[PDB]
Amino acid sequence: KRPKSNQDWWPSKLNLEILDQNARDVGPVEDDFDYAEEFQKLDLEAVKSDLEELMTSSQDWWPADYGHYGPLFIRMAWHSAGTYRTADGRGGAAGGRQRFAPINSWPDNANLDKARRLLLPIKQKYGQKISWADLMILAGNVAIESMGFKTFGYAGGREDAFEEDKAVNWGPEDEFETQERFDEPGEIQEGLGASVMGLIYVNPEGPDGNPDPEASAKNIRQTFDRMAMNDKETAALIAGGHTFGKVHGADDPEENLGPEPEAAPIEQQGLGWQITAGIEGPWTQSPTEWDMGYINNLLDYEWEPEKGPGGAWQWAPKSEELKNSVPDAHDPDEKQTPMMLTTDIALKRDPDYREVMETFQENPMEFGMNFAKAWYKLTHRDMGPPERFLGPEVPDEEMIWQDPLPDADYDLIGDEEIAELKEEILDSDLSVSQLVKTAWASASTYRDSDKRGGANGARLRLEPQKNWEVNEPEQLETVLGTLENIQTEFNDSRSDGTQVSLADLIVLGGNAAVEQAAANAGYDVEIPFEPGRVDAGPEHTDAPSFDALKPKVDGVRNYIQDDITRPAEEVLVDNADLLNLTASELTALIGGMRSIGANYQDTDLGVFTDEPETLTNDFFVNLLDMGTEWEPAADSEHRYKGLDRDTGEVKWEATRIDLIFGSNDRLRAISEVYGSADAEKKLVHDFVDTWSKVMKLDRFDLE
């Protein structure tokens, strides 16, 4: 018997369960587990040696193609990191969530359950010293290296998750291997980096199953772009990956494939699918060796469409010299002919991709360099700054996509200087509101999904953040200019090697403002402050890549972009999850911010108080007062007005962001707590703890 909660009845229901995942770390590992220090005890070279042995250790329950598991593990690794989307930074190898449903049962992940199982003995051998996440990427690397290609490098540090990431919308499809997110090649549903559900990037047979290489290329380009890869990286990755292995399909899988892992019998112990997708054949003459075979086969010969016995589309070589030029995967006394997918032909038919592939063939070294770099990025893009990259194989070179941070070449401020700076900030002409908005704009770009954003680095002062509409550029410049004057003033007055960064000052200023707002309400609060943040420069900032962090809805500032799809409150919850907030923390934060008044354009939306810049629970008290009736504003699709029953007296204006806390059942229970006559101090303390939490999200230093 399976219960039908309020998530299966009404679609327009907020999914607060995603925030509940932040209130607890499920799993048997101690809640204070420090994976980093455990990984440091790991003999990485010994793990690689075991993986090397495993590569050619064909098991009977699942014999290795060509006597080598390398290709299978590369696909495995690529699938693990392939779900990444720049829109929210979700997906990616980070937590090894591929091991859980629904991802572990997608059609495109067929038989990856076998690959992972082959690694079980190694995982058990090293235990907590190496995560599944790290181990899967490491297997990919060893496969590539064992087959003749030295990788760019490798870093451990990916902590294992013990449940699926519920906060991930994979698409509007109720079915797998089918799509309903695009009509024209190059216009898929915004955000998602895949053109088809259950699929990773695009349809292997071509757009909508049609063998149109040119149209496929447009989808490939758009989707890889949403996975943070450009033309050169994309071409290098596809060509590089398909230099190895083959496609599996001895007939039609739609009629020769078994129950996916999640639907398989208990006796199958987590394994399922016991022909993956009709298409059959290798790309090159030597599927287990790094060479120029893929590029040569594609460019040097003409290819044409062909429907296999399963009805699936693949491409065959017009030539006859390539006929039976490839040994069979399991039958020695047999041969096979190289094949190509519509997505491979796309790389030759598209003018831009063709130019890249021609240069690659012309300069084999350039192909290697691009594949190496792209493979390293693909598998480490969601690990955050260099500080999180661990182990002896971490490259000495830091890549710009890691959003690097410089070293603090000076002594850090102490308790005395911290109080001094705090005092001078509040004594300046900066208001509590300016300080809070600036600190929020600096810290709120952080996302726990791929660990990008955050106040460290003070990139708020650089492009593109300094000019984002939501940050109100003109007003932002005033606050940053003033804090920069304070920084100069402090640094020049130091008698020793002590200095303060602008990154720290912005956060210190926010803390001071919150402390001041609480003092105005009669509460004495001291927010813990941790110095050490540094200021990153433009040369170490990939401006365009930060566009992904630009918010469409910002609850704290009551900001809603003019053209959004889903309800404002849905985006708000999605955004709250990126900041690792629970439902109560999200509520305390919004409610308290409204009493302060930190709205974009300084509007009074949701500011249900007559004493601005005073941290109280007035937001809740007034929101819950039945003496007020709410109604949509005439000729306004964002604003709502609170009128006080039916007397008409217009008191208060608000958006859906504010009203959801009095409408959603669970949020209303939290609001009723904060809106009680004995909860003001409780709200103040919860608001401060949440503010402090957000300010320290990118401080992986202390862990």
Ligand X SMILES: O=C(NO)c1ccccc1O
Structure tokens at 275: 């022909």
* Residue span 106-145 as binding mask against ligand X, x where in contact by CB under 6 A, dash where not: -xx-x-----------------------------------
- Active site annotation includes 79: yes
Q: Is 188 one of the binding residues for ligand X (CB under 6 A)?
A: no
In which element (H, E) is residue 316 found?
strand 313-317
CB atoms within 10 A of CB 562: 8
- By a kind-dependent CB cut-off of 5 to 8 A, residue 564 interacts, out of ligand X, its own copies, ligand HEM, none, with none
Provide, rounded to whole angstroms, the least separation between the CB of residue 560 and its own copies. Answer: 14
* Minimum gap (Å) between residue 679 Cβ and its own copies: 6
CB of 135 to ligand HEM, least distance (A): 17
Residue tagged active-site, from 79, 248, 330, 540: 79
- CB under 5 to 8 A by kind: which of ligand HEM, ligand X, its own copies, none does 400 bind? none
Cα–Cα distance, 342 to 305 (Å, whole number): 8
Q: Which amino acid is at 351?
A: P
Sign for the CA dihedral angle at 221, 226, 227, 232 comes to positive
Residue 242 assigned ligand-binding role: yes
The site that binds its own copies (CB under 8 A) totals a number of residues, namely: 100
Site mask, its own copies, residues 625-664, x = CB under 8 A? -x---xxx-------x----x----------x--xx-xxx
SS3 534: coil
Applying CB under 8 A, which part among 6-14, 143-151, 454-462, 550-558 lies near its own copies? 6-14
Can you tell me which of 518, 583, 598, 697 binds its own copies, judged by CB under 8 A? Answer: 583
Residues whose CB is less than 8 angstroms from the CB of residue 493 and which lie 6 or more positions away in sequence, other chains included: none
The DSSP code sequence of 559-593 is EE-SS-SS-HHHHHHHHHHHTT--HHHHHHHHHHH
33 lies in the binding site for its own copies (CB under 8 A): no
> Is residue 205 within the footprint of ligand X (CB under 6 A)?
no
Counting contacts by CB under 8 A, is residue 311 touching its own copies?
A: no
Give residues in contact with ligand HEM (CB under 6 A): 65, 71-72, 74-75, 78, 201-202, 204, 220, 237-238, 240-242, 244-249, 276-277, 341, 343, 375
CB of 263 to its own copies, least distance (A): 5
CB of 114 to its own copies, least distance (A): 10
Helix (H, G, I), strand (E, B) or coil at 246: strand
d(CA 507, CA 438): 9
Q: Which stretch binds its own copies (CB under 8 A): 237-245, 260-268, 404-412, 537-545?
A: 260-268
Question: Is the CB of 191 or the CB of 209 nearer to ligand X?
Answer: 209
Stretch that binds ligand X, among 103-111, 152-160, 425-433, 493-501 (CB under 6 A): 103-111
Q: Shortest approach of ligand X to residue 290 CB, angstroms?
A: 17
Q: Is residue 127 near its own copies by the rule CB under 8 A?
A: yes
Q: Which of 36, 56, 87, 102: binder of its own copies (CB under 8 A)?
A: 102
**Residue number with the smallest Cβ distance to ligand X:** 108
Interhelix angle 70-82/364-380, rounded to 10 degrees, is 50
Residue 658 binding ligand X, by CB under 6 A: no
Q: Which stretch binds its own copies (CB under 8 A): 23-31, 390-398, 491-499, 505-513?
A: 23-31
| Residue 248 interacts with, from its own copies, ligand HEM, ligand X, none (CB under 5-8 Å by kind) | ligand HEM
Return the H-helix or E-strand segment holding 304. strand 303-307
CB atoms within 10 A of CB 187: 13
What's the rounded Cα separation, in Å, for the pair 268 and 271? Answer: 5
For 484, counting Cβ atoms within 10 Å of its Cβ (0-12 exposed, 13-18 middle, 19+ buried), the class is middle
Cα separation of 492 and 498, whole Å?
10
Q: Does 58 bind its own copies (CB under 8 A)?
A: no
Nearer to ligand X by C-beta: 108 or 535? Answer: 108
Assign 3-state DSSP to the chain and report helix, strand, coil percentages, each to 5.
45, 5, 50
Rule CB under 6 A: say whether 204 interacts with ligand X: yes
Closer to its own copies at the Cβ: 499 or 617? 617
Is residue 201 within the footprint of ligand X (CB under 6 A)?
yes
Q: Which residues between 157 and 196 bind its own copies (CB under 8 A)? A: 160, 162-164, 166-170, 172, 174
CA distance 593 to 437: 10
Amino acid at 81: A
Name the helix (H) or strand (E) containing 554. Answer: strand 553-554
CB of 276 to ligand X, least distance (A): 5
Shortest Cβ 219–ligand X spacing (Å): 11
Residues linked to residue 313 through DSSP beta bridges, in sequence order: 307
Closest CA to 346 of 186, 563, 502, 495: 186
Measured distance CA(93)–CA(614) in Å, rounded? 44
Partners of 326 in the β-ladder: 336
Residue 290: count other Cβ atoms within 10 Å of its Cβ.
19
8 Å CB contact between 290 and 147: yes
Smaller CB separation from ligand X, 200 or 548: 200
Q: How far is CA 686 from CA 63, 283, 595, 597, 602, in A?
A: 57, 58, 14, 17, 24
Binding residues: 242
Binding residues for heme b: 242
Q: Which residues are identified as catalytic?
A: 79
